[PDB]
A paper describes a structure:
When five-fold symmetry was imposed, the resolution of local reconstructions for the portal vertex in B-, C- and virion-capsids was improved to 4.05, 4.50 and 5.36 Å, respectively, albeit that the portal was five-fold averaged. The resulting density maps clearly reveal the polypeptide backbone, many bulky side chains, and atomic models of the portal vertex associated P-hexon (PVP-Hex), Ta and PVAT (not in B-capsid) from three capsids were built. Despite distinct organizations of the CVSC at the portal and penton vertices, the packaged dsDNA is visible in the C- and virion-capsids. In contrast to B-capsid, small tail-like density, previously named Portal Vertex Associated Tegument (PVAT), extends outwards from the portal vertex in the C- and virion-capsids, suggesting a possible role in genome retention and release. A comparison of asymmetric reconstructions of the portal vertex of the three capsids reveals notable differences in the position and morphology of the portal and PVAT. Distinct from the virion-capsid, a bulk of obvious densities presumably emanating from dsDNA beneath the portal is observed, however some exterior densities, corresponding to five copies of coiled coils and five copies of the UL25 C domain, become disordered or lost in the C-capsid, consistent with previous observations of the CVSC of HSV-2 C-capsid. These might result from the lack of protection offered by tegument proteins/envelope, indicative of the vulnerability of the role in the retention of viral genome of isolated C-capsids in vitro, reflecting purified C-capsids are metastable and tend to release their genome.
Here we show asymmetric reconstructions of herpes simplex virus 2 (HSV-2) B- (containing scaffold proteins inside, putative capsid assembly intermediate), C- (DNA-filled capsid, derived from the enveloped virion by using detergent treatment to remove viral membrane proteins and outer tegument proteins) and virion-capsids (enveloped intact virion) at 8.1, 9.0 and 10.2 Å respectively. The asymmetric reconstructions reveal a unique portal vertex in the context of the icosahedral capsid, including 1 portal, 11 pentons, 3 types of hexons (P, peripentonal; E, edge; C, center) with the hexameric rings formed by VP26s, 320 triplexes (Ta-Tf) and 12 pentagram-shaped capsid vertex specific component (CVSC) densities (composed of a UL17 monomer, a UL25 dimer and a UL36 dimer, presence in C- and virion-capsids). Radially colored representations of the three reconstructions reveal the dodecameric portal situated beneath one of the pentameric vertices; but, the density surrounding the portal displays a five-fold symmetrical assembly, highlighting the symmetry-mismatch structural features. The portal vertex of the capsid is a hub for protein-protein interactions that are important for capsid assembly and genome packaging.
Residue numbers in the entry:
A (entry chain A): 1032 to 1325
B (entry chain T): 106 to 168, 176 to 215, 220 to 353, 416 to 441, 445 to 466
C (entry chain G): 1 to 45, 54 to 200, 230 to 266, 355 to 562, 569 to 611, 618 to 627, 633 to 696
D (entry chain A): 443 to 589
E (entry chain R): 5 to 166, 174 to 230, 235 to 262, 267 to 318
F (entry chain S): 5 to 165, 168 to 252, 258 to 318
G (entry chain F): 1130 to 1178
H (entry chain E): 1228 to 1276
């Protein structure tokens, strides 16, 4: 039971199986931009604003219009990446709390679940006080001091113990099967086919099909937690690392023409925020301009 | 014309704006020497109408009218006098530690009796102590008063930034963190619409008195059903509870705050920039 | 609590003149639902609709289905009224737990100067959803429901424990109680263990007129004497108005006189509770309008058959019959009717009303199956399903398999309970036809079943293994020499996805408003049956059948 | 290592806030989404409960003759005692790979609609894919928990 | 502001000129907002609506219809009024003439009928061109809503006869509503049509609701919640009124719109909405009868 | 104005850009106060709730909790809207478009009603941005209060059938002539039910203790009927007042409370407020500067503040 | 009947019998009848020649 | 609409009830919505009316 599994771990005993950890560090780097001589356009306009008088004069801004095209048919003027300043969010031990958000039917034995309510959320750094109202965020508390940096989120996915350690000695997909929209061959149906149809083998590790069938298949325990369609979290503003991996629409939503693929990597928008104590999932009004090869 | 001044000469028997802050949500005392008469009228006869004949008469004992009429009621004077009434104790009562150390509970104790006596004979405290403004200047004498505390639209909370270059003036406190009722936790961007609601409980809590400000991006037609919902003080039957008028628009939800520093540590909310639409009252149900 | 209270607002109806009534609070607990056939999980998932109708015992019609209220709360349902729960203060009254169930008060048919009629049944119905599978029916006679008197003597020990527990709560908690609560505690200590609510059932004490118990004590404590020579309840309001902060008319009758009487159920050996407050306009209340009940029929027909030792009152003596008829005139029904459609003087008279309909349809089935299958038949086919080449050898079994089925279909039609038969398609297709000789119950009939005769309605039985029913829902498939099938328009059951007779291991069985049914086998091999030539339902017998099984559509 | 010359530790008491939520017992959409496109008769030896009938004295010779037919038909769902680990992970040799979904549950081809404490011979025909519940940790198959 | 001109017509006398000197600062109603207007749009003779003189209903229809204008400076050959209803909120300070109550520092005063006070007071007549300027009375919102419901209540006891409603204290003063000697006999014939309007909208609806709600709830969320907040109120009113009174759906629901159509008339008729505000500066906060007051534009 | 803009979000059907030009002076219900907002919450697809579209009584309840806005100027990039609820401070009297079959008056209060007319649907369709647009119909307010009583009572006849099928349609309207027929297609129940309850619950409080003395004078009403003109015309033929004619109940406690005066107060509190609690609040008033006494169908009338 | 100043019949059975006997279809005939406040609402016909 | 009279003769609704009414015998024959006549060459003169 979830009640029994609360009651085995604090004692300390291996409960038949294992896990896997997916988390997100963040690194501020000093990039280098080479350019060709004649690449951009960047024209100029005219400067005047007499706006709304706000008291003692409007005080007279003067804005100017411009605009610029890519005057060049190829990959002009590109980019580099060389230094590691400081690891902004820490390498951290901070776990995940699923009681942060409402997502599930509770126990019907209501005496049990309210015991387990505060049993989990006794004193987590990601544990709220005065828990969930009807609409709104959980309001993760603020500790009195922070030292090393922004905090990590260590989300866990159940794994059987009997896989190889050879897988995970590689940059591999943590769900246990290749999932991204790169490998598909433009036959209009292969995208979801490598995703869920485990009749075939892995594109990544083709002597097998998956590595965690609890994390791979449709309606599996991996798929039940972090699917964007199910949206268990969504009230809790804690950013899932695993939200990026487990979304049936979003990887399928991408194109595959390579010209637009690499340039989005130069300026993508993350789901994280460098203006918050935890990985608060990105506020809908702000930009981030991340690199993000994952 | 987006700048105005108003002036009323009263006593410092009431508010004492020298003991107040630069920002206070002043009420007048319209019909001040009134209510021996309306104590007798407008009520069913099972209310024993000889109560308010003495009740306000004990108020001006603590405060002869003369030529300086009793008026310019502070925002503090209702919160602490109802602090023992409504559902907040030892936090609303910190407003009493604000008054009696700066203003006086002698005038509160006569008026907290009025807050059980006015509401007793159906003489409800709405449409008495009408809205006046945000305490611009305090050109008052020693024991007398002469205040300019402008009414008349958005200009009261515009004319706050222009006079002082450093920081901000008035900046419109809420004077209690229990006050400024955080309605609409269902949060979104827009502008704030401020109102002045007196929530009652008639013969359940023995003629309850309440003063607090709501927070909503809601119209007056989307406020009356919002006045029927979210309440637990329906358990009455007399009637005509929960009057309200418009305190006006705060045309920004971004500038609200959370503080406990004023002038005794009293929790307080900064609210910068307000269209003070003076509005109108309504009390039927 | 309030479901007992809001039904009294429906008892506040009054207005237009009609036969005068009462209201009895009846608390069914858990196992009286569980042994009935009520899934306790599905009602645990508080205001809930109950469709009720009332039925006479001897003859006559029934009530239409009345929408009522419910409060199904898993708790100590006796202890929750007695020890209620303030949200801030749930330990205001610690108690002993108990079983729980639905809170439903039920109205009572009476007379002018009301003499209630025992053996006459009010019928409950819980509707989980629309369907007849989401329905059960409950039986209650007034002998089961009506005690002669209540037991407000158990209310005497309860009320002073309330004052001691206001003397117990403030002394434990201390200065954390507000200014209105620190007063009303010690005003209950100058006026003089857990509260077990089950002891109020099991301590032998009840109501008494006590006028005979004053003269029996005045001539007892004068012997004695000759040899020799604001209340506490008003402080209970501030006890609630400070700890809760409001009035709560739900809790207002938890301070007043409460009788909690135990009774029993004649259907499944169960127990239940009969409740009356003081301020209830319902039965047993001390604010109630006359006329009230009279336990006279429950003493007349008993003692005229008990002193005469008449075991069954059709063996009652002819002068002993009519002298009771000279006393109580509504008994001409159950004593002087030639063939009443309801059986006179039996417990299962409503149950034996049902089992005939279970019988009479099976003969209408069983002599109609022989009718279309008199001799060697020619059935050739009626649907369009094409074969693969080795698929015909499957029907080589269906030649050999065939005749054992038609026994075991009818065996299973015998094998069902009739209470479980009324959820099937044939038991409602007849009601779609007996309403045509009116909308039948649970509205399983679609909007377009009453349009043509081509709208049939199927059941599905398992062909191989055991011959078992494979549906909850009547699956109404519109059928067009040949004619291809078509569904209608539209929590997950396996077999409900196919056309009738489309595949192996399925027997398909449809019926009509015309009540010309089909028996569809896999492979198109089907045939009509004129069951309309064999339904022999007498209309005065059937008019008590339909009214208990129809619903007046708005 | 942290963001220093600093050590860190991740226990399995670390896993308290994730495995203990009441969503481990939330398999409503799972049984529904697998239910369509049905499975055929999987000769349900271990996928069906019989109610008892008669004395226990002859109960074998009931079940000996009752499952004389759909026992030599095919195989039971478990064959994985012969299967080594990662032979389950590979696409061949495990048609039941798409049936292992939850750590706390089982999806197996059982009987369709007959209520379980009843009958002897279930009607072999269409099949159903429902649940049971995994009770203790040892019920995980031996290619996932090594011996 | 946008000052509008009303044209003085031809030859008037010096007392007719002095009648124009006793009105500097009154309230004037006008139909349209043309920048040049005449006196023919102003007079009480310009209030004829059905061929007869209007009553206090017939005025309060127009008093809620046409537009207020306040004369700042009086002129020969012109009338300058800076009108209230034009301009942004709380701008364009204007000056009024008080009548017998106070008009305190706030109150939001309301224009209303003359015959609720002395009828031939403020009915100032021009003698030469023979017209009548019946100026409305600027009463503040509490007392203006007070006195309007009292005389129509006094019209009931004057309707079908067999306490005294007329004392009505202010905050300090005792306000003599009764101007007995010749006015009150003209009162109950000049509010004559109006009392019938306050009555017929009550007799229709109450005798409609007592055959509506018994025809409702059985013809269910509104059913049980009908008397939920009306427990021992509506059923008690069903106990009190339906007993000592008398007791049809297709004319009934036809009468449902018609009464509520008349109800929407009366809300526009009654209740005297505020139009202009007193919120002055550097005054004594208390205005007296015959003295000016700085009055600002919008409520 | 306290300027508020709504941009043209994505693409343009080239005649439909001209369709936004001839909507100058109409009304947009935007449920906010924004400096910029998308066009997605503007259209009737936002008026449609979860799964179901509102009825013409539900659209009243849908126009309850949103904010009307005046089209001021139409750009190919944005549309500048002025927030009626606040920014009506216009001595320039920002202008509106009358889209209504009634030639109004000068001086009418104007309240907004959903399109319910038989021939003035105001349906303009955008297919590049897949949206449907229902503009409200500005009308005079007594004519507006004559409509909302019909449509609820038509939905009152949606609860009970009983009567024969020939019902009075509640679908012929009267303004000086001008027979108007409206649409009766669908009546959603909850929009009827919540509107019916406030019609019940307000009429509860509008009866008081001193109200009961007035009920005695019901036979006094018909005594004026056969002896004047005004009363007999006031007394309607299709009224229950002529039907109910075919007493102090003493209970006198104290008798110094003014019981008759207190009756007309609380009656006016709730029965006096029946047009505005059911329908939208009027804040638009007819005010033409040129002395024009009426405003034609399709014209641009100048608009002033709250009546 | 466009006007209303005349005191009507006292018997109601003659009152709204003779009222609608004339008004029934007149070119000047007050339909949706005479409000206490408002206008008589003369029936404008569709076309006039 | 015969509730409104003839614009040509305001003192009468029509001058013919048999043809001028909707679904009357004139409109049954000669309106083209039914086209009782017409697969035929001969011009009906009344088609325009």
């Amino acid at each position: 039971s979830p009640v029994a599994l609360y009651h085995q771990l604090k004692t300390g005993l291996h409960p038949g199986f294992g896990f896997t950890v997916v988390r997100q560090d963040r690194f501020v780097t000093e990039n280098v931009l080479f350019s060709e001589r004649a690449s951009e356009a960047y024209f100029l306009g005219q400067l005047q604003v007499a706006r709304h008088e706000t008291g003692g004069g409007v005080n007279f801004t003067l804005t100017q219009p411009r605009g610029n095209v890519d005057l060049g048919v190829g990959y002009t003027a590109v980019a580099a990446t060389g230094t590691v300043r400081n690891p902004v969010t820490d390498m951290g031990n901070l776990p995940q709390n699923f009681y942060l958000g409402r997502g599930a039917p509770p126990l019907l034995d209501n005496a049990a679940a309210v015991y387990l309510r505060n049993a989990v959320v006794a004193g987590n750094r990601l544990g709220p006080a005065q828990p969930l109202p009807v609409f709104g965020c959980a309001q993760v508390p603020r500790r009195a001091g922070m030292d090393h940096g922004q905090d990590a989120v260590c989300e866990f996915i159940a794994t059987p113990v009997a896989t190889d350690i050879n897988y995970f000695r590689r940059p591999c997909n943590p769900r246990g099967r290749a999932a991204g929209g790169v490998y598909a061959g433009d036959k209009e149906g292969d995208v979801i086919a490598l995703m869920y149809d485990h009749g075939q083998s892995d594109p990544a590790r083709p002597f097998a099909a998956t590595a965690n069938p609890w994390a791979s298949q449709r309606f599996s325990y991996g798929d039940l937690l972090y699917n964007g369609a199910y949206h268990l979290n969504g009230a809790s503003p804690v950013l899932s690392p695993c939200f990026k991996f487990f979304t049936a629409a979003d990887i399928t939503a991408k194109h595959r023409c390579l010209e637009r693929l690499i340039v989005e990597t130069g300026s993508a928008v993350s789901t994280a925020t460098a203006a918050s104590d935890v990985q608060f999932k990105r506020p809908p009004g702000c930009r981030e301009l991340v690199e993000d090869p994952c | 014309p987006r700048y105005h001044l108003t002036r009323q000469v009263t006593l410092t028997d009431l508010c004492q704006p020298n003991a107040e802050r630069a920002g206070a949500l002043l009420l007048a005392l319209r019909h001040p020497t009134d209510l021996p008469h309306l104590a007798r009228h407008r009520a069913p006869p099972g209310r024993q109408t000889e109560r308010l004949a003495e009740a306000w008469g004990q108020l001006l004992e603590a405060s002869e009218s003369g030529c300086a009429r009793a008026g310019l009621v502070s925002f503090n004077f209702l919160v602490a006098a109802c602090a023992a009434a409504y559902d907040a104790r030892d936090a609303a009562e910190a407003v009493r530690a604000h008054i009696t150390t700066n203003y006086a509970g002698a005038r509160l104790d006569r008026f907290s009796e009025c807050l059980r006596a006015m509401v007793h004979t159906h003489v409800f405290p709405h449409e008495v102590m009408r809205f006046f403004g945000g305490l611009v200047s305090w050109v008052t004498q020693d024991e007398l008063a002469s205040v300019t505390a402008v009414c008349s639209g958005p200009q009261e909370a515009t004319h706050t930034g222009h006079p002082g270059r450093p920081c901000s003036a008035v900046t419109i406190p809420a004077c209690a963190f229990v006050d400024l009722d955080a309605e609409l936790c269902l949060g979104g961007p827009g502008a704030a619409f401020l109102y002045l609601v007196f929530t009652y409980r008639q013969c359940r809590d023995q003629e309850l008195c309440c003063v607090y400000v709501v927070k909503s991006q809601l119209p007056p037609r989307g406020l009356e059903a919002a006045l029927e919902r979210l309440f637990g003080r329906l358990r009455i039957t007399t009637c005509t509870y929960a009057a309200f008028a418009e305190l006006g628009v705060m045309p920004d939800d971004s500038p609200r705050c959370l503080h406990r520093t004023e002038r005794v540590g009293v929790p307080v909310v900064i609210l910068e920039g307000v269209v003070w639409r003076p509005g109108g009252w309504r009390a039927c149900a | 609590m309030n479901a007992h209270f809001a039904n009294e607002v429906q008892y506040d109806l009054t207005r237009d003149p009609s036969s005068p009534a009462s209201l009895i609070h009846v608390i069914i607990s858990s196992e009286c639902l569980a042994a009935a056939g009520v899934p306790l999980s599905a009602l645990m998932r508080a205001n809930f609709r109950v469709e009720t109708q009332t039925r006479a015992h001897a003859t006559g019609d029934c009530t239409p289905w009345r929408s009522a209220f419910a409060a199904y709360v898993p708790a100590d349902a006796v202890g929750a009224l007695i020890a209620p729960v303030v949200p801030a203060h749930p330990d205001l009254l610690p108690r002993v737990p108990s079983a729980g169930g639905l809170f439903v008060s039920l109205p009572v048919a009476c007379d002018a100067q009301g003499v209630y009629d025992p053996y006459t049944v009010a019928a409950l119905r819980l509707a989980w959803g629309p369907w007849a599978t989401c329905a059960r029916v409950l039986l209650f006679s007034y002998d089961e429901l009506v005690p002669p008197n209540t037991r407000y003597a158990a209310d005497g020990a309860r009320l002073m424990r309330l004052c001691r527990h206001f003397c117990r709560y403030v002394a434990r908690l201390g200065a954390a109680a507000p200014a209105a609560a620190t007063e009303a505690a010690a005003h209950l200590s100058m006026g003089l263990p857990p509260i077990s609510p089950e002891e109020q059932l099991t301590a032998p004490g009840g109501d008494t007129a006590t006028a005979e118990d004053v003269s029996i004590t005045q001539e007892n404590e004068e012997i004695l004497a000759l040899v020799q020579r604001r209340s506490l309840v008003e402080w209970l309001d501030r006890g609630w108005e400070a700890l809760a902060g409001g009035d709560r008319p739900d809790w207002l009758w938890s301070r007043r006189s409460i009788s909690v009487v135990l009774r029993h159920h004649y259907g499944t050996k169960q127990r239940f509770v009969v409740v009356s407050y003081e301020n209830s306009v319902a039965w047993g209340g001390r604010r109630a309008r006359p006329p009230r009940l009279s336990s006279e029929l429950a003493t007349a027909l008993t003692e005229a058959c008990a002193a005469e030792r008449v075991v069954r009152p059709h063996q009652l003596s002819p002068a002993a019959q009519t002298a009771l008829l000279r006393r109580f005139p509504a008994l001409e029904g159950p004593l002087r009717h030639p063939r009443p459609v309801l059986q006179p003087f039996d417990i299962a008279a409503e149950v034996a009303f049902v089992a005939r309909i279970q019988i009479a349809c099976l003969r209408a089935l069983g002599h109609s199956i022989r009718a279309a299958l008199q001799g060697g038949p020619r059935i050739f086919q009626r649907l369009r399903y094409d074969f693969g080449p080795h698929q015909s050898e499957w029907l080589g079994e269906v030649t050999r398999r065939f005749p054992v089925l038609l026994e075991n279909l009818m065996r299973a039609l015998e094998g069902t309970a009739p209470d479980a038969f009324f959820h099937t398609a044939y038991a409602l297709a007849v009601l779609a036809h007996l309403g045509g000789q009116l909308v039948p119950l649970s509205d399983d009939i679609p909007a377009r079943f009453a349009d043509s005769d081509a709208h049939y309605a199927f059941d599905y039985y398992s062909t191989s293994g055991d011959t078992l029913r494979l549906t909850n829902r009547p699956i109404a498939v519109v059928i067009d020499e040949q004619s291809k099938c078509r569904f209608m328009e539209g929590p997950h059951r396996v077999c409900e996805q196919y056309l009738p007779g489309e595949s192996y291991a399925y027997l398909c069985l449809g019926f009509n408003r015309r009540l010309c049914g089909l028996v569809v086998f896999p492979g198109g091999f089907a045939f009509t049956i004129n069951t309309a030539a064999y339904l022999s339902l007498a209309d005065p017998v059937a008019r008590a059948v339909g009214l208990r099984f129809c619903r007046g559509a708005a | 290592w942290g963001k220093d010359h600093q050590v860190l530790r991740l226990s399995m008491e670390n896993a308290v806030g994730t495995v203990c939520h009441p969503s481990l017992m939330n398999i409503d959409a799972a049984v529904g989404g697998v239910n369509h496109d049905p499975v055929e008769a999987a000769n349900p030896y271990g996928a069906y409960v019989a109610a008892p009938a008669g004395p226990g004295a002859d109960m074998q010779q009931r079940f000996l003759n009752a499952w004389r037919q759909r026992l030599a038909h095919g195989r039971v769902r478990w064959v994985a005692e012969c299967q080594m680990t990662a032979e389950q992970f590979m696409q061949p040799d495990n048609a039941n790979l798409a049936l292992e979904l939850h750590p706390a549950f089982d999806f197996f081809a059982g009987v369709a609609d007959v209520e379980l404490p009843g009958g002897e011979v279930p009607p072999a025909g269409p099949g159903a894919i429902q649940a049971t519940w995994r009770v203790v940790n040892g019920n995980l198959p031996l290619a996932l928990c090594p011996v | 502001c946008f000052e509008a001109d009303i044209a003085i017509p031809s030859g008037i006398s010096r007392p007719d000129a002095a009648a124009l000197q006793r009105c500097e600062g009154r309230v004037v109603f006008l139909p349209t907002i043309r920048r040049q207007l005449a006196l023919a749009d102003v007079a009480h003779e310009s209030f004829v609506s059905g061929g007869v003189s209007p009553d206090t209903l017939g005025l309060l229809l127009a008093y809620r219809r046409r537009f207020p204008a306040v004369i700042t400076r009086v002129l020969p050959t012109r009338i300058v009024a800076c009108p209230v209803d034009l301009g942004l909120t709380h701008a364009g300070t204007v000056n009024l003439r008080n009548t017998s109550p106070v008009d305190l520092c706030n109150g939001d005063p309301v224009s209303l009928v003359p015959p609720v006070f002395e009828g031939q007071a403020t009915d100032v007549r021009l003698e030469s061109l023979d017209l009548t300027l019946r100026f409305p009375v600027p009463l503040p919102t509490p007392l203006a809503r007070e006195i309007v419901a009292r005389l129509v209540a006094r019209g009931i006891r004057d309707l079908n006869p067999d306490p005294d409603l007329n004392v009505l204290y202010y905050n300090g003063a005792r306000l003599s509503l009764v101007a007995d000697v010749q006015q009150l006999a003209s009162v109950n014939t000049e509010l004559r049509s109006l009392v019938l309007n306050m009555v017929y909208s009550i007799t229709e609806g109450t005798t409609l609701i007592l055959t509506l709600i018994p025809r409702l709830l059985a013809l269910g969320y509104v059913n049980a919640l009908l008397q939920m907040q009306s427990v021992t109120r509506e059923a008690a009113q069903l106990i009190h009124p339906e007993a000592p009174m008398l007791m049809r759906r297709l004319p009934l629901y036809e009468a449902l719109v018609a009464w509520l159509a008349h109800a929407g008339q009366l809300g526009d008729i009654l209740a005297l909405a505020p139009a202009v505000r007193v919120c002055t500066f550097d005054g004594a906060a208390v205005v007296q009868s015959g003295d000016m007051a700085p009055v600002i534009r919008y409520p």
